[PDB]
Amino acid sequence: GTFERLLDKATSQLLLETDWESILQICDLIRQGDTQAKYAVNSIKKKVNDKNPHVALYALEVMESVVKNCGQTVHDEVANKQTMEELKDLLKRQVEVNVRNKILYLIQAWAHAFRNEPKYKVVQDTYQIMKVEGHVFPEFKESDAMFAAERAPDWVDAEECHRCRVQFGVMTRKHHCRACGQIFCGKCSSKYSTIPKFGIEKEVRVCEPCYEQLNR
Ligand SMILES: [Zn+2]
Ligand SMILES: [Zn+2]
């Protein structure tokens, strides 16, 4: 029950300012895998759509933080067509300027944050649409779009290659994919890539599926 208690606490109409303690605990729960991102983001979205603009604004601040801090598992839940449509709709019916302004702030911030990720293009597409419709965005600060690097996965040991199942031995050395942490023979891990999301800016060994996910 902790995620839910905290979300309630963070979006209380009693608050005079952002409850950073509760927000950062919510971020930690998602990063640690204690709370699933889809459920978390769905729960926050329910609050974003509240008729009370204080609740909606506080919920948008929770959304801002989970996106900034929680990595791809959360980005997958916001940088999609369903969410962009819901925010376009919300922005169109919202009569409260601070909620409106925050939606614009976030769309702009995310569109810049996601500029290297083709799977997330719908956010930049939505930004451009909104500008054509006449929305005046707040001035952009680089700081808005600077997200926390994610933690690279721990490496797995095993007796055989994760892909081809060859047995490791003297003539078949163990290697690891830096992107997923699984264990491979050399034949199955002969690709090299940067991994920006983990702050890896040198080309490091990856498996073939990770290589293709990374080099779209
Ligand atoms: Zn192999
Ligand atoms: Zn991999």
Side-chain angles (χ1 to χ4, degrees), residues 1-50 52-71 73-80 83-91 93-145 147-169 171-216:
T2 303
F3 166 75
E4 297 85 354
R5 185 185 62 77
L6 292 170
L7 182 59
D8 286 350
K9 196 167 191 269
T11 57
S12 172
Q13 57 173 347
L14 288 55
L15 293 167
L16 296 68
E17 56 181 328
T18 308
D19 184 352
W20 288 105
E21 189 74 48
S22 299
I23 289 177
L24 288 174
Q25 288 177 250
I26 286 166
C27 294
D28 283 354
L29 292 166
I30 300 166
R31 287 194 312 100
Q32 291 154 189
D34 300 317
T35 302
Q36 294 307 107
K38 190 176 233 47
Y39 175 77
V41 175
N42 287 347
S43 301
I44 295 161
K45 276 173 187 173
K46 293 200 212 77
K47 296 291 188 165
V48 169
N49 295 304
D50 249 15
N52 185 305
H54 169 110
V55 174
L57 183 60
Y58 279 143
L60 284 164
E61 289 179 351
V62 179
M63 188 169 258
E64 178 184 358
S65 289
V66 298
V67 173
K68 180 161 274 262
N69 296 134
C70 299
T73 189
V74 164
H75 306 159
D76 287 351
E77 298 298 325
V78 311
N80 61 60
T83 304
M84 291 295 99
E85 292 312 307
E86 285 157 354
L87 292 169
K88 273 191 290 181
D89 285 358
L90 182 59
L91 178 60
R93 71 182 175 263
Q94 183 51 251
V95 304
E96 204 282 313
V97 60
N98 301 115
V99 172
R100 297 179 58 84
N101 285 341
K102 190 65 166 191
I103 296 163
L104 294 176
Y105 166 84
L106 290 171
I107 294 168
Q108 177 168 260
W110 296 348
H112 287 82
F114 296 149
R115 66 192 182 284
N116 307 141
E117 297 292 347
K119 57 171 170 177
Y120 299 148
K121 206 163 98 70
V122 66
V123 186
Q124 193 180 332
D125 299 342
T126 302
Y127 183 45
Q128 290 300 320
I129 281 191
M130 284 174 170
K131 286 198 278 193
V132 300
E133 282 156 7
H135 291 280
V136 175
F137 284 84
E139 165 176 4
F140 174 69
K141 304 161 302 218
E142 305 301 336
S143 151
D144 302 337
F147 283 9
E150 300 180 48
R151 178 64 166 67
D154 299 322
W155 288 10
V156 178
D157 190 49
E159 71 283 18
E160 61 187 28
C161 176
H162 183 67
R163 178 171 178 176
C164 75
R165 325 305 312 197
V166 63
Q167 303 302 297
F168 297 116
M171 205 87 232
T172 305
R173 197 193 287 275
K174 291 175 172 182
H175 305 280
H176 291 83
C177 173
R178 278 60 172 165
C180 70
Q182 268 293 351
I183 195 174
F184 299 92
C185 78
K187 193 174 59 149
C188 297
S189 54
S190 75
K191 301 299 203 340
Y192 295 85
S193 185
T194 66
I195 313 172
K197 60 175 178 186
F198 300 158
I200 301 170
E201 284 304 333
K202 297 216 186 102
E203 292 170 344
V204 301
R205 183 180 297 264
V206 293
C207 76
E208 299 190 2
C210 291
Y211 178 79
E212 297 291 346
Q213 289 169 238
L214 290 166
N215 291 275
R216 311 165 176 299

